[PDB]
Amino acid sequence: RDGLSNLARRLRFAMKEGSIWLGEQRMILLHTAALGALRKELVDTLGMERARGLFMRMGFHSGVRDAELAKTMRSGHSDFGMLEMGPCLHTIEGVVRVTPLTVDINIAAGVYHGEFLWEDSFEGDVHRQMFGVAQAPVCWMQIGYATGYTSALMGKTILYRELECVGCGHPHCRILGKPLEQWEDGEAELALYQPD
Amino acid sequence: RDGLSNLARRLRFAMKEGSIWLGEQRMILLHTAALGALRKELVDTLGMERARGLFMRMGFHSGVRDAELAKTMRSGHSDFGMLEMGPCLHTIEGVVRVTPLTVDINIAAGVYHGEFLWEDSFEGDVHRQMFGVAQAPVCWMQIGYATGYTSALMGKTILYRELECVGCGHPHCRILGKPLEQWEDGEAELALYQPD
Ligand SMILES: Oc1ccc(Cl)cc1Cl
Numbered sequence A, B: 001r002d003g004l005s006n007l008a009r010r011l012r013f014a015m016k017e018g019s020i021w022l023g024e025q026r027m028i029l030l031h032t033a034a035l036g037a038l039r040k041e042l043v044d045t046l047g048m049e050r051a052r053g054l055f056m057r058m059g060f061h062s063g064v065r066d067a068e069l070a071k072t073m074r075s076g077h078s079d080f081g082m083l084e085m086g087p088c089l090h091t092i093e094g095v096v097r098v099t100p101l102t103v104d105i106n107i108a109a110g111v112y113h114g115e116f117l118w119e120d121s122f123e124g125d126v127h128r129q130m131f132g133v134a135q136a137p138v139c140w141m142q143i144g145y146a147t148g149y150t151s152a153l154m155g156k157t158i159l160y161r162e163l164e165c166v167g168c169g170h171p172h173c174r175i176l177g178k179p180l181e182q183w184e185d186g187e188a189e190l191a192l193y194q195p196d
């Protein structure tokens, strides 16, 4: 049920070069407390609104790259088994523990409906460290990744939103992803992914 | 290098918890392209000088945290051996391949003069690809890390600077670290490490 094995062969640590590679993308290992401190400076000086955009887009770029890696290992993987490489990649990257609740996907037909549980999210625990409990969900980067990955996989914009978030006192995160036009505020969610 | 083998044992993947740990500090695997894209947005909107400080301070926090890890492993190690853990962790994290050249350290005496070679500096590759060759050295986060690691380790302000940088088109990066007092522009360099 897990593709963590098939996708781990794609992860090379080259200690005698000082580089890490996931597929054909170079990675770094970064301290979450380092990213936390950057988030603090970004919210404090740019506001929660602008800061959230910067992270969602960073997240978006990451998800799109991992969709590219997923596409190369298609061979005979169903649409769903294709989709599932996203949550797998998220875990391996140590961002969060992803659990697909229910997923309806057809790539050819442009149909997608997806719900997930986000157990153990760094962003959530990182936001809490730096700001305490939040009024709105705080897994920005993580949400940008889901949007980026799924959109690049479908060839059309799939936006995600957190229906529940540990950053808001909840026990875990709960997220929903579906085509842009099935969101009433979708035009305005989509503006969050635009640099400027 | 014995440091790389001993320290690499401190890194573990706990996928059940969707987590990656280096010692007692949680880590994520992040695409350098995603970080590069954030660097570009921050430079485009806040300008080079302010984007530089943000990344230097992010690296600093990283360095200070790896220093806390090296300290727990302070046994049987000379002052040099403990200093060497910084370069090793930086390399393990895939940030850059670090070659210590000459290192003069005595922690109890407050003695520190350190020169280092950097190859494959992610900060250098990512900057050139988003901005082209730069005028001044471009590996902000990497310098912040050496500064934070060594200051934490020495118990006093050690500042680092690139005398050469691939982001300026040189074959490599060359780094000098030494106490605040021995830098001509020392006070101005210390300024970059404080928020706004
Ligand atoms: O965390 C995730 C990463 C990729 C996809 Cl498609 C969904 C989720 Cl919840």
Ligand SMILES: Oc1ccc(Cl)cc1Cl
Binding pocket: B083, B086, B087, B090, B096, B098, B116, B117, B142, B145, B146, B149, B150, B175
């Ligand atoms: O890249 C580095 C990491 C730690 C220390 Cl002490 C020096 C350097 Cl140049």
Ligand SMILES: [Zn+2]
Binding pocket: A118, A121, A124, A137, A138, A139, A162, A164, A165, A166, A167, A172, A173
């Ligand atoms: Zn959340």
Ligand SMILES: [Zn+2]
Binding pocket: B118, B121, B124, B137, B138, B139, B162, B164, B165, B166, B167, B172, B173
């Ligand atoms: Zn450099």
